[PDB]
UniProtKB/Swiss-Prot annotation:
May form homohexamers. Interacts with N protein. Residues 1-167 form the Macro domain. It comes from the Viruses. Responsible for the cleavages located at the N-terminus of the replicase polyprotein. Participates together with nsp4 in the assembly of virally-induced cytoplasmic double-membrane vesicles necessary for viral replication. Antagonizes innate immune induction of type I interferon by blocking the phosphorylation, dimerization and subsequent nuclear translocation of host IRF3. Also prevents host NF-kappa-B signaling. In addition, PL-PRO possesses a deubiquitinating/deISGylating activity and processes both 'Lys-48'- and 'Lys-63'-linked polyubiquitin chains from cellular substrates. This is Papain-like protease nsp3. Changing S164L: In strain: Gamma/P.1. Signal peptide: none annotated. It catalyses: Thiol-dependent hydrolysis of ester, thioester, amide, peptide and isopeptide bonds formed by the C-terminal Gly of ubiquitin (a 76-residue protein attached to proteins as an intracellular targeting signal). Inhibited in vitro by GRL-0617. It is a multi-pass membrane protein. It is found in: Host endoplasmic reticulum membrane. The chain holds residues 1025 to 1191 of 7096 of the full protein.
Amino acid sequence: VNSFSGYLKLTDNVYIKNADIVEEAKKVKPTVVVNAANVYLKHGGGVAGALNKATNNAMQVESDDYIATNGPLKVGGSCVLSGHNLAKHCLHVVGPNVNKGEDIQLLKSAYENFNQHEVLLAPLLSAGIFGADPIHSLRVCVDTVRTNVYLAVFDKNLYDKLVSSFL
Ligand SMILES: Cn1ccc2c(N)ncnc21
């Protein structure tokens, strides 16, 4: 049993809810919240800007030290950092950004990072300002992630479309 509430069940391991990932993290304090990161961990907008704002910029300070030591992530890659006031850990995952021309085939590689964690609160990747089709992102999620994932969809309109169209 876990603390996640109000999720509609899609598969054995994937759950979905119309939710503000920030508000959900604050309420649940999950072991892992996933950030929709870029390779520079520059948390300016979207899931990353909202998560970072909720940490009072501590996520950005920690991320800048990580990049100064390690250099940029790979598209499709991830790193584990603090969850600050939102979660135990934040898994920063880089999905391909269509609005920068990245290979959408890298979306499956991105979601494979989730399999290193038994339970996660996560947004869809490559959705929103990363420019991918969220219906596609949900299909790749279901077909890739084997661990238990709780998806927070920000848009009510999009949430209803993802559920209604789910195969
Ligand atoms: C996709 N996207 C963008 C903002 C956002 C949020 N606050 N929660 C979940 N997903 C989100």
